[PDB]
Amino acid sequence: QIDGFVRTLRARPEAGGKVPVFVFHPAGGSTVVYEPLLGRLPADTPMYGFERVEGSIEERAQQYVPKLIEMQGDGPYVLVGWSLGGVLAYACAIGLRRLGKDVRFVGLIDAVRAGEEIPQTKEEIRKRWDRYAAFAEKTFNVTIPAIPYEQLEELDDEGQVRFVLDAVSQSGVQIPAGIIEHQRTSYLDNRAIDTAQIQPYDGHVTLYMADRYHDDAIMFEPRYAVRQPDGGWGEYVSDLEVVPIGGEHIQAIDEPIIAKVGEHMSRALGQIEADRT
Ligand SMILES: COc1ccc2[nH]c(C(=O)N3CCN(C(=O)C4CCN(c5nc(C)cc(C(=O)NCc6ccccc6)n5)CC4)CC3)cc2c1OC
């Protein structure tokens, strides 16, 4: 199944064959979310999923890019991601080009920025933190946590999610170990988007643009209620292609919407497979 952090969805032929598609995992999820997408793609299309690793967005691309080079050498590279997955796809695209590699397609599946830019002041930190606590107060019962006022600052990424365990567990609630792990990696991963700096990219990038964020994203950060037509990428990508697919961010990876993604996407993998001559 899984070698290191690389999941095989469809192995590439012993010899020759088409170009593999590299997909990257979403926050709190594995790359089997790309199985519908793979269904809507040309037949013997290889597909390989990059699973979670630790670090900032830049730290994670430094582990992925060597593995990409081991698998695909100089190119051509097809890089596809949904949600956080597209941010990971973009970083790897940057990193591969900086080493002179041939990246010919970057597919962003509604990897869309909050319309207006998210402030990173004290007051907004406190604020988005309450809206995170709000989730834990409805989901795991426990309407009785507490808000810190300077504890938040001094703690790091891990200390912060560790701090919410100490709070919920002393209510008397036993969160199952598997649920704790999942919430923890969802936190670290969404936090790595928080701090990431986008770099400019002069290659082709396709944004598959749904039309709205689902409800619990707006609950955490209401700036996700509005979207720009470019998704926040227009400043950084000269050759940006926006493809409509409608629906909500959470639906974009699924049937039926994924069918519009993969129909277009097959209209590029055909172009690439051609331009291999
Ligand atoms: C120029 O800059 C640009 C340009 C273009 C860009 N595109 C993107 C992009 O592709 N994506 C991926 C899809 N996205 C999400 O899925 C959201 C992620 C946060 N969110 C949430 N929702 C819940 C329910 C929980 C959490 C969470 O736990 N947060 C951690 C945290 C931090 C602090 C306090 C408390 C918790 N987060 C709602 C969904 C948005 C980001 C980014 C980006 C960009 O900036 C880097």
Numbering used by the authors: 1451 to 1727
Copy the relevant paper text.
Pks13 is a multidomain enzyme that performs the final step in the synthesis of mycolic acids through the condensation of a long-chain fatty acid (C24–C26) and a very long-chain fatty acid (C56).12 The product is transferred from Pks13 to trehalose by the Pks13-TE domain. Pks13 fulfills a critical function for Mtb by performing a condensation reaction of a long-chain fatty acid and a very long-chain meromycolic acid to form a mycolic acid. Pks13-TE is a validated target for the development of antibiotics for Mtb. In previous work, we identified TAM16, a potent lead molecule for Pks13-TE. X-ray crystallography verified that compounds from all three different series were binding deep within the active site of Pks13-TE, displacing the side chain of Arg1563 with atoms within about 4 Å from the catalytic Ser1533 OG.
The structure of the series 2 compound X20419 in complex with Pks13-TE was solved using X-ray diffraction data collected to 2.2 Å resolution. Crystals were in the tetragonal P41212 space group with one molecule per asymmetric unit. X20419 was found to reside within the same channel as that for X20404, extending through the core of Pks13-TE via a conformational change in the Arg1563 side chain. Most of the contacts between the protein and the inhibitor are VDW/hydrophobic interactions with the addition of two hydrogen bonds: between the N9 of the indole ring of R1 and the carbonyl of Ala1561, at 3.3 Å, and a weak bond between the catalytic Ser1533 OG to the carbonyl (O21) of the inhibitor, at 3.2 Å. The terminal aromatic ring system of R1 forms VDW interactions with the carbons of the Arg1563 side chain. Two methoxy substituents on the ring contact the Ile1648, Ile1643, and Tyr1686 side chains. The piperidine ring of R1 is angled to achieve a pi-stacking interaction between the pyrimidine ring and Phe1670. The piperidine overlaps with the position of the piperidine in the TAM16-bound structure, while the pyrimidine extends into a space occupied by the benzofuran of TAM16, without causing the Phe1670 side chain flip. The enamine linker of R2 places the terminal phenyl into a hydrophobic pocket created by the side chains of the Phe1670, Tyr1637, Arg1572, Arg1641, and Trp1579. The C16 of the piperidine is also 3.4 Å away from the catalytic Ser1533 OG, in addition to the H-bond to O21, thoroughly blocking substrate access.
